[PDB]
């Protein structure tokens, strides 16, 4: 309609600074298909991989702190907790393990997932984590009693990212069924099922200050306030690659990594793509490989960290692009 | 669902369904289907409304054309005209670039002009083209076409101007052509000629000489200017030119 387009044209987005590559830390001998940082501090960030390991990394130096070898198969995801000094990690060996960070050694392997487990999210407020695998089910664990407390049946296929919010919409799943769910853990049921994607929403992330949750199928990055479970915006992601990552920055600077490796940045809520970045790879590696598989920002937000399939981790420092809608 | 309804031959329900479908900003195809259905039904009251709705939902100039075509098929000439006006008005109204390509608007304008021509009164077409010009190349072309169809002198002049512009863009032969066009308002032409001269190895020299000669001729037709030209030539530095100057 003309009534909306005109309005869109009238409104302007804020000039977010562009992004330039800063650090590249070829250290893993495998994909680096998870990355995470400490809520409390931003000194280190760990990165689980197809190595089977996960390595810890000092941001400032870029130096490899230490390794951790508590899986058999490849690590798919990790989550350092704000409220406790535990690092949860999870691998396609079906193990959702829990590393003490006072001793850097596993403690509570949680057992229950029938098959390769894709993501963890620690609940920001509770002493409870949430994991989901190709199982097609998101189980919540009491961390003390290392048992699945509840489980969330709804989904009809493998479930990827499964973020935890502190409100009522306490889990924000995202499947290959292309539904992204909002659940009520307490009710033992769904509350609202965002079906707006076309394909496997293989990426989703909570906004820090804004109580919303960007989510990405093969192209269209939707983003939504999950209070009602209502759409907020659609991003200009029109011919970008298969969106692997979908991290959001503190300053409303949503990042999206592709299977292409084209690092695409967007103003959040606007839905305005305001940068593209061509990937890079090593002289030995192939041009098809290069692809940002996992990524996240620091708590401040000036450094984006992208794990790419070059067996690398690339950290990114910081005139905006013209609007032009449909 | 629609086909089932058709088979049944209960039509109100089908209509309702169609309406519902069309409220969900569906495909152009759906809209077209709906239109077809409406046509098939006896009434042509409501079809217009639906078309309007479609247009509103799909700001696309092809839609407008389609609507017009329906109007044409229908008996009323006034209605078509009104529709055209509305289309034009809508295009005008969004001055901001929230728009279908400038080719599509041009096309629409052309169509309107054609319609007008087919109708009794031609002034209207001319007016429309003037309006178009005021609010580019495509538009100009359309205007020219309209003129041809039909004022003729004006059209010719416009064409000449366009040609001159093209020549300038391309840019000795071109310069000459431009000069000729200018010769074919007088003050403006003179200015243009002067500019060309200013703009203006052996070949180049020859061209320059020719230009100078032309200028001299112009002056004659119209002494100080000639003197100035001579001075300029001298500075640049021919014998023939000097002789001519002396004679003058």
């Amino acid at each position: 309609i003309v009534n909306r387009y005109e309005k869109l044209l009238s409104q302007r987005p804020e000039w977010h600074a562009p992004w330039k590559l800063s650090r590249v830390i070829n250290g893993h001998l495998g994909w680096v298909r998870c990355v995470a940082i400490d809520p409390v501090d931003n000194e280190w960030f760990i990165t689980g991989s197809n190595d089977t390991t996960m390595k810890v990394w000092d941001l400032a130096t870029g130096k490899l702190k230490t390794t951790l070898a508590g899986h058999v198969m490849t690590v798919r995801d990790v989550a350092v907790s704000d409220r406790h000094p535990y690092l949860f990690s999870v691998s396609e060996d079906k193990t959702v393990k829990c590393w003490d960070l006072e001793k850097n050694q596993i403690i509570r392997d949680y057992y229950g997932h029938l098959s390769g487990v894709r993501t963890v999210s620690i609940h920001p407020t509770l002493d409870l984590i949430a994991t989901a695998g190709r199982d097609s089910v998101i189980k919540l664990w009491d961390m003390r009693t290392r048992i699945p407390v509840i489980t969330l049946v709804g989904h009809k296929g493998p479930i990827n990212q499964v973020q935890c919010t502190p409100v009522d919409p306490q889990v924000v799943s995202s499947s290959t069924d292309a539904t992204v769910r909002l659940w009520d853990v307490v009710a033992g049921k769904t509350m609202k099922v965002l079906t707006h994607h076309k394909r496997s929403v293989r990426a989703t992330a909570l906004h820090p200050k804004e109580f919303s949750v960007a989510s990405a199928c093969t192209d269209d990055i939707r983003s939504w306030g999950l209070a009602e479970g209502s759409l907020l915006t659609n991003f200009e992601s029109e011919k970008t690659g298969i969106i692997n990552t979908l991290s959001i920055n503190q300053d409303d600077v949503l990042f999206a990594g592709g299977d292409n490796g084209v690092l695409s940045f967007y103003d959040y809520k606007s839905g305005h793509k305001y940068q593209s970045l061509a990937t890079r790879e090593m002289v030995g590696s192939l041009e098809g490989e290069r692809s940002v598989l996992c990524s996240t920002f620091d708590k401040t937000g000036l450094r984006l960290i992208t794990g790419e399939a070059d067996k690398s981790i690339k950290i990114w420092k910081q005139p905006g692009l013209a609007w032009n809608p449909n | 669902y629609l086909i089932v309804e058709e088979s049944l031959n209960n039509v109100e329900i089908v209509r309702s369904l169609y309406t519902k479908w069309c409220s969900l900003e569906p495909g152009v195809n759906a809209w077209n289907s709906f239109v077809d259905f409406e046509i098939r039904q006896k009434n042509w009251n409501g079809v217009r409304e639906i078309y309007s709705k479609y247009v509103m939902a799909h700001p696309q100039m092809q839609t407008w054309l389609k609507w017009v075509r329906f109007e044409n098929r229908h008996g009323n000439t006034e209605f078509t005209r009104s529709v055209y006006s509305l289309a034009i008005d809508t295009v005008a109204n969004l001055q901001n670039l929230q728009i279908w390509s400038d080719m599509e608007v041009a096309k629409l304008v052309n169509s309107f002009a054609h319609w007008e021509a087919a109708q009794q009164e031609y002034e209207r077409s001319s007016a429309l083209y003037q309006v178009a010009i005021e609010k580019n190349q495509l538009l100009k072309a359309g205007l020219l076409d309209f003129e041809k169809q039909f004022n003729s002198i004006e059209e010719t002049i416009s064409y000449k101007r366009k040609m001159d512009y093209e020549t300038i863009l391309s840019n000795y032969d071109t310069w000459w052509l431009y000069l000729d066009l200018i010769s074919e308002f007088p003050k403006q032409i003179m200015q243009t000629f002067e500019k060309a001269i200013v703009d203006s190895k052996n070949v180049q020299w020859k061209r320059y000489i020719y230009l100078w000669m032309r200028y001299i001729c112009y002056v004659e037709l119209e002494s100080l200017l000639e003197e100035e030209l001579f001075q300029r030539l001298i500075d640049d530095i021919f014998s023939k030119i000097w002789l001519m100057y002396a004679k003058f």
């Binding site: 759409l231 | 519902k20 900003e25």
Partner: peptide, 24 residues
Amino acid sequence: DQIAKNVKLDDFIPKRQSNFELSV
């Protein structure tokens, strides 16, 4: 009518696209 009730237009519409200062 029932069908219409079942699926509404505002679902397809993003809410932020109209109002930017609006924040959840």
